[PDB]
């Protein structure tokens, strides 16, 4: 069974850091690329960050470049998302998502298609 | 036969002289075919690190 355990709840004031943790069950962590997508109320889904199957960070967003950071933990099947020096304008709901494509699906690396 | 008997006069008969033996002419090595491979081409052709 594929269970997503999201940890790091609490209250944070602007000007400080934040840290969220993704845990996955029912599938192998390394085989799929892991992405973060956020969606404030009264607005659609919007990509905020991502990282490939090879634990390669893809970049930082246009609005929050220089402060967000993303990392994987292939040893313990976990994921870290750290928010450096947050501001009150960054308030929204964070979302953790997994890819689908099976490894070596032929002509680039399979890293897309969030489903769960 | 003369130097087998340690003599200069060989008397009528049959004398075992030496040994005949064929030698190996070439070398043959065999193994089952190779099927699997290590995932190095999956790393060096990857899109990113």
From Swiss-Prot, chain B:
Glycosites: 25, 27, 33, 45
Region (Disordered): 21-37
Superkingdom as given in the UniProt entry: Viruses
Annotated effect of mutating residue 45 to Q: Reduced viral infectivity
Consequence recorded when altering residue 48 to K: In strain: Mu/B.1.621
Function of the protein: Attaches the virion to the cell membrane by interacting with host receptor, initiating the infection. The major receptor is host ACE2. When S2/S2' has been cleaved, binding to the receptor triggers direct fusion at the cell membrane. When S2/S2' has not been cleaved, binding to the receptor results in internalization of the virus by endocytosis using host TFRC and GRM2 and leading to fusion of the virion membrane with the host endosomal membrane. Alternatively, may use NRP1/NRP2 and integrin as entry receptors.
The protein's assembly and partners: Binds to host ACE2. RBD also interacts with the N-linked glycan on 'Asn-90' of ACE2. Cleavage of S generates a polybasic C-terminal sequence on S1 that binds to host Neuropilin-1 (NRP1) and Neuropilin-2 (NRP2) receptors. Interacts with host integrin alpha-5/beta-1 (ITGA5:ITGB1) and with ACE2 in complex with integrin alpha-5/beta-1 (ITGA5:ITGB1). May interact via cytoplasmic c-terminus with M protein. May interact (via N-terminus) with host bilirubin and biliverdin, thereby preventing antibody binding to the SARS-CoV-2 spike NTD via an allosteric mechanism.
The name this protein goes by in its record: Spike protein S1
Residues of the full protein shown: 299 to 347 of 1273
């Amino acid at each position: 069974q594929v269970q997503l355990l999201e940890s790091g709840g609490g209250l944070v004031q602007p000007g400080r850091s934040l840290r969220l943790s993704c845990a996955a069950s029912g599938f192998t962590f390394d085989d799929y690329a892991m992405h973060w997508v956020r969606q404030a109320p009264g607005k659609g889904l919007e990509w905020v960050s991502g990282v490939s199957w090879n634990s390669g960070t893809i970049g930082y967003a246009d609005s929050v470049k220089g402060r967000f950071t993303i990392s994987r933990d292939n040893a313990k099947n976990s994921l870290y998302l750290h928010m450096r020096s947050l501001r009150a304008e960054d308030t929204a709901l964070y979302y953790c998502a997994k890819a689908v494509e099976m490894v070596r699906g032929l002509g680039a690396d399979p890293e897309y298609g969030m489903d769960v | 036969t003369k130097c087998t008997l340690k003599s200069f006069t060989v008397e009528k008969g049959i004398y075992q002289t030496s040994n005949f033996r064929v030698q190996p002419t070439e070398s043959i090595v065999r193994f089952p075919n190779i099927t699997n491979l290590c995932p190095f081409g999956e790393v060096f052709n990857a899109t990113r690190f």
